[PDB]
Amino acid sequence: IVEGSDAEIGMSPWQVMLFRKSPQELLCGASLISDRWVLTAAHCLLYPPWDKNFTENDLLVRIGKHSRTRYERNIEKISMLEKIYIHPRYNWRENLDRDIALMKLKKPVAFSDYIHPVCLPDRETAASLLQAGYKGRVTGWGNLKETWTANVGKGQPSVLQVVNLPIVERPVCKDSTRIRITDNMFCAGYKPDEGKRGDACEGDSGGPFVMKSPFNNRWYQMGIVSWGEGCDRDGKYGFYTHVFRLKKWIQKVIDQFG
């Protein structure tokens, strides 16, 4: 997360961590959607150009965390994945259309003060909250600044970061890229005239993009950190996976496979 801040203890109880066994490393972010289902981005699991095609036994899901590197003994909970369900029409060749994957846990997770799920939007919450101008929230243990130039210094958070971003108009999103954008995505970020900064970045992928409902003070996940060009760069926004639009798929697999 670029130009964000440290998260508060228990502030994002749905944030999940994809941690690879060998080598041992943070793979991406994710989110508790229930006690046995986690929502992540297809590309964390499947991306040929970089030689990725992880299997269920290839990794672990660690929930309850705050610190990035610390094994927080009686706070976090590491669970094994049973099966992984990625979207059938996912596109890694061209634009990352339908960057969505669901993962099923072997055993249900025990909710605590630090572990709790996020709601999934619905037609009316989507309609009344997904508006250009409205601010959302992104969490992740990803990079502190674009992996580039003469970045002298750390570049890795020690504790979970967080940044509040505004939703941008579709016309303005499509025009900042030469990349084909689809309705299964949407961008967020300060427009140039704002002269402000903040963004997700490498390592924040599959992480939730949330919003608080003013009509039931409840949190709904509206997007999944999907892609970008650079991080925190001028006149460029970050694209997220449109969760509400892929919901039809989300329901289909869950109510059929657990």
């Binding site: 801040s5 508060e8 203890i9 228990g10 502030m11 109880p13 959607i33 229930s34 006690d35 046995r36 289902w37 605590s112 003060d113 630090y114 709790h116 799920p117 996020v118 709601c119 999934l120 909250l129 101008g133 409205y134 601010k135 959302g136 929230r137 967080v162 509040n164 505004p166 919003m211 608080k212 409902s213 003013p214 039931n216 003070n217 409840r218 949190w219 709904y220």
Partner: peptide, 28 residues
């Protein structure tokens, strides 16, 4: 999972706020 989702034990359940929460709300 569902039904009790979106309610954080250390905040919404304690009628407590997180440092940047109103920024969200007031943008609406």
């Amino acid at each position: 999972g569902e039904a009790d989702c979106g309610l954080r034990p250390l905040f919404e359940k304690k009628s407590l706020e997180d440092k940047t929460e109103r920024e969200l709300l007031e943008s609406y």
